Amino acid sequence: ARSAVAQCQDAGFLVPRPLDALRQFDVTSAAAAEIMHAVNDAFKTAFDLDGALLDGLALYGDPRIADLSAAYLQYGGNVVREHVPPGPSHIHRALQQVESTFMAEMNLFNVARGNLYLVQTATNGNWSPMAPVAAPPFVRGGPNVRVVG
Amino acid sequence: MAQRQFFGLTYNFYGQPAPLFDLNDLQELAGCYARPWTSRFSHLAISTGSLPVWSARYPSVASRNIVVNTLLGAHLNPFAGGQITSHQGITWRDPVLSSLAPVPAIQPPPVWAVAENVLLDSNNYPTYVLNLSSMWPINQDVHIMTMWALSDQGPIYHLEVPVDPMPAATTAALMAYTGVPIAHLAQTAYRFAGQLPQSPDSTMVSTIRWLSAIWFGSLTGRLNRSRTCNGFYFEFAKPALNPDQAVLKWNDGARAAPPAAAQSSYIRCISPHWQHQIVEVAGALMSQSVTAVTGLPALIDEATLPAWSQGVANLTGNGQGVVPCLDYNPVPMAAARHLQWRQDGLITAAQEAQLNNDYTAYALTIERHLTAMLVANPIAAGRMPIQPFNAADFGQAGQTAAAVALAQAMFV
Amino acid sequence: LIGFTWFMQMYQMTPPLPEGAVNRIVCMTNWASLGDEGRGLEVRLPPPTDSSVHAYKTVLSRGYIDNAQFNPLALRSNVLLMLLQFTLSNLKINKSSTFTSDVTTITSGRMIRAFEGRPELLALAYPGRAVLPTQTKNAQFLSTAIADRIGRLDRANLIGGEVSAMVECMELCDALTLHIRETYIMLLRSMHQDPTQIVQIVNECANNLLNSTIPISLRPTILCPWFASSEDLRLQQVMHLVNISSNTA
Amino acid sequence: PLRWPGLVDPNYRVGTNDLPNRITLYNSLYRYNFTYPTLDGIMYVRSAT
Amino acid sequence: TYNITGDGNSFTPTSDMTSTAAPAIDLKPGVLNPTGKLWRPVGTSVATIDSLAIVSDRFGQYSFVNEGMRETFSKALFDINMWQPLFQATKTGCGPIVLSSFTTTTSGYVGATAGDALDNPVTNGVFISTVQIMNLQRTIAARMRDVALWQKHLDTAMTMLTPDISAGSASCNWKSLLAFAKDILPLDNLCLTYPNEFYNVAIHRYPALKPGNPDTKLPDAQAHPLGEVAGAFNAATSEVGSLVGS
Amino acid sequence: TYNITGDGNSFTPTSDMTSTAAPAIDLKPGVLNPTGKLWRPVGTSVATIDSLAIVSDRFGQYSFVNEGMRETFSKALFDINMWQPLFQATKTGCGPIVL
Amino acid sequence: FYNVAIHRYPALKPGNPDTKLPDAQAHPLGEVAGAFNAATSEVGSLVGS
């Protein structure tokens, strides 16, 4: 849940951001929540976990989860903070690795990368829109051509 | 086996005019079985039901080992002569030795010549070779037998460290062992050898060899949580204490340095206390099963061996491989392991470790005095249900220094 | 000649490769995986020819009931949970198999999977089972490959009876999925408690009142997924405390 | 050939993949199953003995 | 290597480039030490700190190696290396020693006395053996005694029309020089048998000198070997003659 | 220590083993240095880089120690150590310094 | 004095400590410095020259 979300918004949680080029808006508190609830749910179902009094309540206010920890405060000016780390994360590691691989095999998951050109082509002998040769690309600083956005 | 190495040294006579057996007791012991040293023996000895603290004829687990040696030593040796010199009370039921009878049949022709100490050389025994496939389980025994008879003390064991040669397959499959203590693993691992002639060049041999390295390096201290062979290392459940059992943990992260080309070494536990240290024993059994499939390198120098076990065909070497002894007594080991951790800053510099030590020395004294007093107990008869005691063995010199240095070496 | 006329018999060479003009890799979690039932969480892709958009109508789509169309800005979103689901639907203990000899009067020997129920997808399972047809693209592939590789290569032989730890058999499988499940099964194994421990545990807890002596047998093929870190319980109970949030109920 | 390296290339271990670049078709599979036992223990009154 | 009997070769003796080699090194006793011999906690585990025995002087594992002595010694080996093609051609065991191989791992306690050593443990450093140094030295000495004729001969050349301008800069046709050399020099010289080597070596020692014609394009360079460094210190400055001197 | 008045003792003077001790060491001024005295950014946080005051010469915190001088000096201490049993027996403050 | 002597002069061995082994080849550090004062095949003293 941490790692996933941190790829949705600009968070300084410790993870590389492989999928940076894949279209995504910078999510808010509220939105993050919504996604996270999905996450939650999936987990639930996968593992036959019907008790909503498990994981549920994690999204009840700023679900910008990074380092979940608890403390005690003593009147003599002091605080005792227990920072409880997770160690092994096999699932998480497998997810990441799945991403890394994804980075190269995106088409398999029907995610195709690039852009299109709209160009007058009529002919008996043509490839596919999936096989470009050299010409479909153009440049800003090209004679007679003008480049607008 | 595929390789012409059917070699088993008999165990020498400890002043006695005789092999150290008792006929009565060996007969009695054949209650649920009849074969030589198989799974059946091991699963009674190291049972899932019991570990009989001083059994009437067998004071320790080791006791059982030692007798087994001498048993084979006597009547199995007949076999290595090119016809089966089978008798002596007992006698092999059949040409391939598949069972023993405590008495000759209708046909008693097989002579026995008055036997001393001999190298069971099945290679010279046509039948054996003939059916290597099936005879295979003997080979496992012979080698381990040898490794109790080559010397006058606790197991002669071989060690091996690779470099980067742990290919994907192996490393993967080693992960299945995560959480299994050697305690249990031993039993399964042993039975392996029995199963069939496998391949020298296989994953099995690699793994077992690697596990052995993990156990030692852990034992000594120089491998640990902080110094892992790619996560791999044993936790000795309770540290530096007499009751310490080895459990495999993958402590990811702090991963030990690739060594220079390779490592090879030998060790021997030179203390009668190994008789109550089931772990180390099972250890050597395991690794001797690897031997059965492999051409064990680096022969042992003359000097380092006892009088009786001098000038031994396969064994004696010059510019070969030495046998460093061991920590030998758990108390030394303690210290080492604790000062790793102290240097590390894993644990309290002067607290836990002193606690362990004290208890361990307590524990020691008790098991020690007991084992030893019971070694006293034999007397006169042709038995001896246990490896002899010497006052000297209680020493702490035995290549300690050397061992420490070796393990140190290993981390890099 | 389609099929090998073996006297009074026909050996129909069932094509190991898709005998298409066009053939595409398509994600289909557990396509050929006939297990205990199934997760349900099946990441099912249509052929490219059909509108794959369904798969993506997960996240921000609440509002926009545009069946043709995905919100692009929520793509990363879409894809993250999809991947999660692919992971989840693939988390299975790939059970130990029964293996046989190659009974069929082609080249007998090889050790082959006894497929779940019926012998269905064998051509695909084992490319090598397909003899030698003609001079095709299909054939050129087969030509290039060696026979040896198809099948059971090494089976954990040392089985108390015949409880295997692993069968090492090469088959049609996905390296990724495979690697996934292996790390899952690692997880499980690490969690292995012995009933021995449990004795000592429970007993100690009872303040010496009880001894829960547990018999056990010498069986290495036991699996007890129970052991945890204090860390795990602390963090879980953190949740439980949060769970309260000034609701006495 | 790339999708099928384990089958087609003899020089390669039967396991090996080519990740994250390529997803292999044909990997030396492992077929696994365990004993999942019931907890059958005997309870005896320690302190009282 | 390049044909010596070519064109493009500079005869530029400069103050900057004052001949030097490594004639002798410091071997003062005092200087030999650095320092601690390597020891062990009896031999058992980490408990016996109270007691140390020296590592295996027997045939190996000795003291923590002299940083300076290593550095020095390796340099020495480089002298011989300056003539490697020639050694090799002479078949005189040329094979560059690689001192480093001798400098073998020592792991444990570091100190002068048991006393001191008890306190300090230094894991997986390096020692050298008495034996080893014996045989190492043996080699180096032998190397030197093999070169003893060469050195002399090299020297003769270098004085027979001395390329030594201690102050400033000189230049003249190297060709001119070279040919008169070979017209005047005694036939019995090793220099006349080994022209090609001697010159190569010379060039390798004397940055002040350039090869023949190797690429007549580029016969000359500004980067030479290490030499340079030491030379700058013997070269006269604006306010002082010699820095080393004073 | 061993009884000196025993058998087995070799009298083998070799070229290899030419008497030596450490008679004197190099203490040239030049040689004393290596090098940098240790300082601080006034005394406040990481801002005052512009300004340094030397550490506590007062009674402690001085310069970065001479690597060579350390190494040398420790050696020197080892000379005394060669006679430790004798010092000790003489009750002459024997206790090895530990530089 | 003898002990010290022995500790300085590798050239000298102890009495009878283990008459077995009174002699050794490893002595203290000394050695090192000594090798440099010992005459070689082509030179007298290295330090010297």
Q: CA F91 → CA B82, F85, F86, distances in Å?
A: 76, 10, 9
Residue E49 CA to its chain's centroid (Å)? 42
Interface test with A, best of D2, D3, D23, D24 (most A CBs within 10 A): D23
Amino acid type, B170: T
Percentage helix, strand, coil for chain G under 3-state DSSP, each rounded to 5: 30, 0, 70
At E16, give phi and psi (nearest 5°).
-60, -35
Angle of helix C75-88 relative to helix A90-105, nearest 10 degrees? 120
> With an 8 Å Cβ cutoff, are F78 and E116 in contact?
yes
In sequence order, the β-bridge partners of residue B119 are B9
Interface test with B, best of C153, C155, C158, C226 (most B CBs within 10 A): C158
Residue whose tokens read 């005047």: E184
> With an 8 Å Cβ cutoff, are D19 and C164 in contact?
no
Distant-in-sequence, close-in-space partners of B318: CB < 8 Å, separation ≥ 6: B301
CA pair distance B339, E49, nearest whole angstrom: 10
Amino acid type, E202: A
> With an 8 Å Cβ cutoff, are D42 and C163 in contact?
no
Host H or E run for residue E40: strand E37-41
Q: CA B94 → CA B27, B89, B91, distances in Å?
A: 18, 15, 9
CA pair distance F25, E29, nearest whole angstrom: 9
CATH of the domain at B375: 1.10.287.1520
Q: Which two tokens stand for residue E171?
A: 């230049």
* Planar angle of CA C81, C85, C87, nearest 5 degrees: 115
Q: Chain C contacts of D17, Cβ < 8 Å?
A: 175-176, 179
Query: Using only C-alpha atoms, what is the Rg of chain D?
Result: 24
> With an 8 Å Cβ cutoff, are E35 and F74 in contact?
yes
CA atoms within 13 A on the CB side of E212: 16
Contacts with D, C 122-161, CB within 8 Å: 127, 144-146, 149-150, 153
Q: Which two tokens stand for residue A51?
A: 């008790």
Mind telling me how many Å the CA of G26 is from chain E's nearest CA?
Answer: 4
CA-nearest residue to F75 within chain G is: G29
Indicate whether B356 and B322 sit together in one domain.
no
Q: How many CB pairs under 8 A join A and D?
A: 15
Indicate whether B200 and B344 sit together in one domain.
no
DSSP characters over A20-69: TTS------HHHHHHHHHHHHHHHHHHTT---STTTGGGGSS----S---
C206 contact D CB<8A: yes
Mind telling me how many Å the CA of A11 is from chain D's nearest CA?
Answer: 25
CA pair distance B84, B100, nearest whole angstrom: 13
CA pair distance C152, C156, nearest whole angstrom: 11
Identify the sign of the CA torsion C48, C50, C54, C60: positive
Mind telling me how many Å the CA of A114 is from chain D's nearest CA?
Answer: 19
List the chains bordering chain C where 3 or more Cβ pairs fall under 8 Å: A, B, D
CA atoms within 13 A on the CB side of B37: 26
Indicate whether B242 and B333 sit together in one domain.
no
Q: Chain D contacts of C95, Cβ < 8 Å?
A: 31-33
Q: Determine contact, residues B188/C158, Cβ cutoff 8 Å.
A: yes
> With an 8 Å Cβ cutoff, are G14 and F5 in contact?
no
B168 contact C CB<8A: no
Indicate whether B161 and B233 sit together in one domain.
yes
Q: CA B126 → CA A112, B8, B138, B146, B377, distances in Å?
A: 70, 17, 15, 22, 43
Q: Which two tokens stand for residue F80?
A: 């005394």
E32 contact G CB<8A: yes
Q: Chain B contacts of E42, Cβ < 8 Å?
A: 396-397, 400-401
Mind telling me how many Å the CA of D15 is from chain B's nearest CA?
Answer: 7
Residue E241: how many CB atoms within 10 A of its CB? Answer: 13
> With an 8 Å Cβ cutoff, are C55 and A110 in contact?
yes
Interface test with C, best of A62, A89, A90 (most C CBs within 10 A): A90
CA-nearest residue to E56 within chain B is: B402
**Is chain G in touch with chain F: ≥3 Cβ pairs within 8 A?**
yes
Q: CA E203 → CA A90, B333, C96, E6, E13, distances in Å?
A: 63, 61, 74, 14, 12
Indicate whether B342 and B390 sit together in one domain.
no
List the chains bordering chain F where 3 or more Cβ pairs fall under 8 Å: E, G
Q: Determine contact, residues B410/B222, Cβ cutoff 8 Å.
A: yes
CA pair distance A19, A8, nearest whole angstrom: 10
CA pair distance B46, B61, nearest whole angstrom: 8
Q: Determine contact, residues C128/C150, Cβ cutoff 8 Å.
A: yes
Q: Chain E contacts of G36, Cβ < 8 Å?
A: 27, 29, 32
Pairing of strands E52-54, E37-41: antiparallel
Indicate whether B84 and B202 sit together in one domain.
yes
In the three-class reduction of DSSP (H, G, I as helix; E, B as strand; rest coil), residue E169 is classed as strand
C45 contact A CB<8A: yes
Identify the sign of the CA torsion F59, F60, F65, F68: positive
In chain C, DSSP assigns E strands to 4-6, 9-11, 99-100, 112-113, 151-155, 167-172
Contacts with B, D 1-49, CB within 8 Å: 13-16
Overall residue count recorded for chain B in this entry: 412
Q: Chain C contacts of A38, Cβ < 8 Å?
A: 58-59, 81
Angle of helix B61-71 relative to helix B132-149, nearest 10 degrees? 120
Host H or E run for residue E125: strand E121-127
* Planar angle of CA B20, B23, B26, nearest 5 degrees: 90
Method by which the model was determined = cryo-EM
Q: Chain C contacts of B173, Cβ < 8 Å?
A: 166
CA pair distance B22, B383, nearest whole angstrom: 5
CA pair distance C119, B97, nearest whole angstrom: 45
Indicate whether B212 and B353 sit together in one domain.
no
Contacts with G, E 153-182, CB within 8 Å: none
Angle of helix B182-195 relative to helix B278-291, nearest 10 degrees? 30
Q: Which two tokens stand for residue B35?
A: 């074969």
CA pair distance B138, B142, nearest whole angstrom: 6
CA pair distance D21, D18, nearest whole angstrom: 6
In sequence order, the β-bridge partners of residue C75 are none
Contacts with C, B 22-81, CB within 8 Å: 43, 47-49
Q: Determine contact, residues B371/B277, Cβ cutoff 8 Å.
A: no
Which one, of B98, B88, B83, lies nearest residue B27 by Cα? Answer: B88
A131 contact D CB<8A: no
In SS3 terms, chain B reads as CCCCCCEEECCCCCCCCCCCCCHHHHHHCCCCCCCCCCHHHHHHHCCCCCCCCCCCCCCCHHHHHHHHHHHHHHHHHHHHCCCCCCCCCCEECCCCCCCEECCCCCCCCCCCCCCCCCEEEHHHCHHHHHCHHHHHHHHHHHHHHHHHHCCCCEEEEEEEECCCCCCHHHHHHHHHHCCCEHHHHHHHHHHHHHHCCCCCCCHHHHHHHHHHHHHHHHHHCCCECCEEECEEEEECCCCCCCCCCCEEEEECCCECCCCCCCEEEEEEECCHHHHHCHHHHHHHHHHHHHHCCCCCCCCEECCCCCHHHCCCCCCEECCCCCCCCCCCCHHHHHHHHHHHHHHHCCCCCCCHHHHHHHHHHHHHHHHHHHHHHHHHCCCCCCCCCCCCCCHHHHCCCCCHHHHHHHHHHHHC
In the three-class reduction of DSSP (H, G, I as helix; E, B as strand; rest coil), residue F23 is classed as coil
C83 contact A CB<8A: yes
Q: Determine contact, residues E22/E238, Cβ cutoff 8 Å.
A: no
Contacts with F, E 178-237, CB within 8 Å: none
Overall residue count recorded for chain A in this entry: 149
Q: Chain D contacts of C137, Cβ < 8 Å?
A: none
Q: Determine contact, residues B83/B42, Cβ cutoff 8 Å.
A: no
CA atoms within 13 A on the CB side of F8: 16
Q: CA E125 → CA A139, B116, C163, E104, distances in Å?
A: 61, 50, 50, 8
Amino acid type, B219: L
Q: Which of B48, B175, B187 sits opposite C216 (nearest CB)?
A: B48
Overall residue count recorded for chain C in this entry: 249
**Is chain G in touch with chain C: ≥3 Cβ pairs within 8 A?**
no
CA-nearest residue to D17 within chain A is: A101
Host H or E run for residue D28: strand D26-31
Indicate whether B220 and B360 sit together in one domain.
no
CA atoms within 13 A on the CB side of D48: 7
Indicate whether B316 and B377 sit together in one domain.
no
CA pair distance B250, B228, nearest whole angstrom: 8
> With an 8 Å Cβ cutoff, are A55 and C245 in contact?
no
- Is the preceding omega at residue C225 within 30 degrees of 0, hence cis? no
Residue whose tokens read 């002040």: E208
A104 contact D CB<8A: yes
Which one, of E187, E191, E205, E177, lies nearest residue E149 by Cα? Answer: E191
Pairing of strands B263-269, B154-161: antiparallel
In sequence order, the β-bridge partners of residue D27 are C171
End-to-end Cα, chain G, rounded Å: 34
C157 contact B CB<8A: yes
Indicate whether B394 and B369 sit together in one domain.
no
Indicate whether B254 and B346 sit together in one domain.
no
In the three-class reduction of DSSP (H, G, I as helix; E, B as strand; rest coil), residue F40 is classed as strand
Q: CA B278 → CA B64, B69, B323, distances in Å?
A: 12, 17, 21
Q: Which DSSP state fits C249?
A: -
> With an 8 Å Cβ cutoff, are G26 and E57 in contact?
yes
Contacts with B, E 35-54, CB within 8 Å: 40-49, 53
In the three-class reduction of DSSP (H, G, I as helix; E, B as strand; rest coil), residue F96 is classed as coil
Residue whose tokens read 């004073």: E246
C223 contact D CB<8A: yes
CA pair distance C197, C214, nearest whole angstrom: 10
The count of domains in chain B is: 2
Which one, of C197, C199, C195, C189, lies nearest residue C223 by Cα? Answer: C189
* Planar angle of CA C220, C221, C225, nearest 5 degrees: 105
Indicate whether B132 and B240 sit together in one domain.
yes
C111 contact D CB<8A: no
What is the extent of the structural domain holding B368?
329-381
CA pair distance B82, B104, nearest whole angstrom: 19
End-to-end Cα, chain C, rounded Å: 78
Which one, of B41, B142, B133, B35, lies nearest residue B92 by Cα? Answer: B35
A101 contact D CB<8A: yes
Mind telling me how many Å the CA of D10 is from chain C's nearest CA?
Answer: 8
G4 contact F CB<8A: yes
Contacts with A, C 158-177, CB within 8 Å: 176
